Structure formats: structure tokens, C-alpha cells
Amino acid sequence: MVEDILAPGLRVVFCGINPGLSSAGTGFPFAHPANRFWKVIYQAGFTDRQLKPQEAQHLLDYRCGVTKLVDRPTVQANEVSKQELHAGGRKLIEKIEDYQPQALAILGKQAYEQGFSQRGAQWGKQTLTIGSTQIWVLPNPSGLSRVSLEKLVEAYRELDQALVV
DNA sequence: CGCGAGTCGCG
Structure with missing residues (x-):
């Protein structure tokens, strides 16, 4: 199982489809060294x-x-059903209503659309919101x-810069 | 008419 890293007052909440088989075992998000996440958010500007x-x-x-979105671990993100993705979104909505981040960032165009029942969604900022929380793909x-x-870096960089202080 | 559903080839 891979615990969530949430708290109130966050400026961004990153969200992926489900845990990979490596991440699952370590109990850490994006644990496999082939996944660019950590490098990206660093270079994007989120961490020093x-x-x-x-x-x-x-x-x-x-x-x-x-x-x-989904807890069930898997090798590739495409093994998760829309049924699972659509249910996952519903639960994500609650966490957001709970922690109320400045922005929710869904890492996966398909993930978003499935999880939030949205069609032809474009990369970047979405008009869709969750209260004061804005949503990004x-x-x-x-x-x-x-x-x-x-x-990848630019994409995340746009968001970082987008969230002023 | 529209609408909502049912792999391949890419570094």
C-alpha cells in the first residue's frame, strides 16, 4: 500500500493513476528510478x-x-479500468474538499477525463474547479x-509559476 | 442528424 502525502495549506497536490509494482513494495510514490517525477518537480521549481x-x-x-486515483498496484497505468478510475475520482474529490489545496494536478490526460468524466480535455489548466482549488492536467x-x-519540465513549470504568492 | 460506445505505432 502507498500512503498519501496530504496536509492543509498545500499549494499543489500531485495525483497519479495507481502505484507501480516497485512503488507498491517500497511504500513510496513514484519509487521506480525510471519515473521522471522527482527530477521534473525539482527542475520545474517545486523543490530545491x-x-x-x-x-x-x-x-x-x-x-x-x-x-x-486507484490504489491497486500495476505494471502499466492502462490496466486500471475506467470503472476504477471513475470511482477513484469521486474519492479524490473528497480529499480535495478536505485538504483544500490551491491546485489539484492530475498526471494523466486520460486519467483526468475518466476520473472526472470529461471529454476532449486539453493539457494545462481546466475551467473545472473544486471550490477554491483549481485543476490542472x-x-x-x-x-x-x-x-x-x-x-515534461515546462508543463510543470507553467503550473509552478501559475501559482503565485 | 448526435450521441455513446467498440487498437496501433511512436523514443
């Missing part, structure tokens, strides 16, 4: 250095959170995505 999955809890210090940091690091 590149954290290891071990230090995940220290994200709160930078006022960032992490969670997932960011490309998945998996090394399976043919999306380049340079692209």
Missing part, C-alpha cells in the same frame, strides 16, 4: 533539490502533496511516455 522516493514526506515542507512522468523531459 531532487528528492529520493524515500524523502517523499518532506514534500509537505515545500507545501506539495501526492496521492493517486499534466503529462505523466513515466519513462513509458514518449514525452521528453524538456517538455
Whole structure:
């Protein structure tokens, strides 16, 4: 099982589909060294250095959170049904109403659409909100995505900069 | 008419 990293007052809550088979075992989000997440949020600007999955809890210090749509671990994100994704979204909504982050960031275009029942969603900011929490769709940091690091970084960077203080 | 559903080839 992979515990959530949430707290009130966060500026961003990162959300993935489900745990990979490596992450599941370690009990850390995006634990497999092939997943660009940690490098991306670092380079994007969310952290002052590149954290290891071990230090995940220290994200709160930078006022960032992490969670997932579906708990069931899996090799590839595509093994999770829409049924599971749609249910996952419903529960995510509650956590957001609970912790009330400045922004919810879904890592997966399909994830978003399924989880929130939305069609033809575009990358970036969504008009959809959850109270004061704004919603974003960011490309998945998996090394399976043919999306380049340079692209991935910009995407997240836009959000960071988008959340002023 | 519209609408809502039913893999391949890419680094």
C-alpha cells in the first residue's frame, strides 16, 4: 500500500493513476528510478533539490502533496479500468474538499477525463474547479511516455509559476 | 442528424 502525502495549506497536490509494482513494495510514490517525477518537480521549481522516493514526506515542507486515483498496484497505468478510475475520482474529490489545496494536478490526460468524466480535455489548466482549488492536467512522468523531459519540465513549470504568492 | 460506445505505432 502507498500512503498519501496530504496536509492543509498545500499549494499543489500531485495525483497519479495507481502505484507501480516497485512503488507498491517500497511504500513510496513514484519509487521506480525510471519515473521522471522527482527530477521534473525539482527542475520545474517545486523543490530545491531532487528528492529520493524515500524523502517523499518532506514534500509537505515545500507545501506539495501526492496521492493517486486507484490504489491497486500495476505494471502499466492502462490496466486500471475506467470503472476504477471513475470511482477513484469521486474519492479524490473528497480529499480535495478536505485538504483544500490551491491546485489539484492530475498526471494523466486520460486519467483526468475518466476520473472526472470529461471529454476532449486539453493539457494545462481546466475551467473545472473544486471550490477554491483549481485543476490542472499534466503529462505523466513515466519513462513509458514518449514525452521528453524538456517538455515534461515546462508543463510543470507553467503550473509552478501559475501559482503565485 | 448526435450521441455513446467498440487498437496501433511512436523514443
